[PDB]
Nucleic acid binder design. Sequence first.
DNA 1: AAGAGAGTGAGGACGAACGCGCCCCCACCCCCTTTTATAGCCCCCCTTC
DNA 2: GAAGGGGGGCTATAAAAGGGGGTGGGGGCGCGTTCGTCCTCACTCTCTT
Lengths: 222, 158
Amino acid sequence: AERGELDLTGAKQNTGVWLVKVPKYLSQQWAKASGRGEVGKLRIAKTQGRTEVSFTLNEDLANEHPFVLQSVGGQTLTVFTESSSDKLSLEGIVVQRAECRPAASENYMRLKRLQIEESSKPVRLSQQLDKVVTTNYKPVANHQYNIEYERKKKEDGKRARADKQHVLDMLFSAFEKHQYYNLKDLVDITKQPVVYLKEILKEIGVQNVKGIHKNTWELKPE
Amino acid sequence: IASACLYIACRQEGVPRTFKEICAVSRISKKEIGRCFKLILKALETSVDLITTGDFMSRFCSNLCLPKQVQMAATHIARKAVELDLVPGRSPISVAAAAIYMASQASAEKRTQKEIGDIAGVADVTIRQSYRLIYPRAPDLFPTDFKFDTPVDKLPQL
DNA sequence: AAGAGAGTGAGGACGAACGCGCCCCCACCCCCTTTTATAGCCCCCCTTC
DNA sequence: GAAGGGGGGCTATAAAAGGGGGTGGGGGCGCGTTCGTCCTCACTCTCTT
């Protein structure tokens, strides 16, 4: 007994179930209400040496479905369900397979044609355009992306030259986090001018040639 | 440099495009194109003939789906307004847009102030200012052989 | 007169070389700001209906 | 909520200041392929036996 255990009780009882193939319109009508608890009646008629299966559509639902059985000896089928509470169980074993066919032949294709046309609605096609489009590349003093970027840079402003002591303290404090830093990445952390930062870094720090990516600055002066 | 050169090339060929039109096709702002435009002229020691109101009537009217008669009237109105000095100091593009608006309002094909501004690249406020200056002399500016769908006396006032 | 080792022909895996980039660093320029008159153009915000 | 008007901003123009940031031109070396050197093996002679 565990979460992954399968409740194989249905197999023990050898419960039999029927697998039925039905078209979409029959199920679509059921899916319309799908909560009235009734969609039709399944009638089975048996004779001395012949059995026939047929289904009748509900009168309210509409506002004959002959059934053909199929051999199940070529493949063994079982039905299982997964409970929302993580408790899998086996409903039973399929004992017969059936298929549903339309009683009508001529006007039935008309319903199918509507479905094919209906499923063709998302099929987009190129549209002829009477007048050439004149709304593209409209005159503009400056692009929106450009002024927004320009405004951001102006608001942020240029980086200022902080005192050497404060810059040095920040550099040494950040050195503990990682052994080595990239010049570009170090600039963001220190937020100082590249030329000014390089001069400070040169005064104490040095760059070591690394054969894996490239020569990078090392915060350790020695 | 290329965007400014494209602007000069259009001027030198007699089919000027306004700085906004060139900017709309380039990542470079209109301000920078003008800066390079003046530098190029100094470097090349060349010059470009001053643009006129009629240099944009064909493109603007065609882009506005206006008939030929409206374009002819719009060209006549803009030239006459400049000749009469009704809009001294106004940019030719502003006058052209206002002239198009006056002619458009006087025909079956009527274009709003916003529509002309978008194609002309001129703010509707600017079109309003230029139109207000030429509105008083509307009967004189319109061509003599022009059919008014809306009478000149009933042109929009604003 | 007969064994291991070898010559030769011949097939299969590996290292140095050759490119072939992608990233970087160093000149060079531009931009920032301030002042002022000018006029047109344009944008944000307020107000009227 | 649509539309007009008021106030405010952008642009060029010169000129100087000092310095951050962007960009173009060279320089630097890591990693995916390619060929010759190296190494392994099947089928016959030879020195030693």
